[PDB]
RNA sequence: UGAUGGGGUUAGCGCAAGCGAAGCUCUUGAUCGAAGCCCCGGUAAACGGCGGCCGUAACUAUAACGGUCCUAAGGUAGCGA
């Protein structure tokens, strides 16, 4: 199925549009322990 | 205003050229001499003037931004085929 891009209408490149579309954002993900690990509830209880 | 210097003329000294004092003259004109101009600042509802180039962002585009040259200063608000 298809996919509503952000930049409306995209003229030359047809892949290096999509790059910055948030489609292709960073994904950067989350540390435990690490410098961001604070927990407050766990995924259980 | 006329210093100072130069020239003409001639009483005279030299039988020669030549020099030549006073006086009268022709000329040069140092000195003294103001505003103005140059110079110093001001004033634009005084006459007037009020920029180029080159890049630069999340496809493209455009450039908020940056570089550099020049000017007395680079046109602001408002409007604008």
Known sequence: SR???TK???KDNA???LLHDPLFRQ???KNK???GSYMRK???G
Request: charged fraction near 35%; avoid cysteine; hydrophobic fraction near 20%.
């Open 27 to 29: 994904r950067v993900e």
């Open 3 to 5: 996919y509503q891009h």
């Open 15 to 17: 892949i290096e549009a």
């Open 8 to 10: 409306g209408q995209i």
């Open 33 to 35: 322990k690490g410098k």
């Open 42 to 44: 766990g995924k259980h």
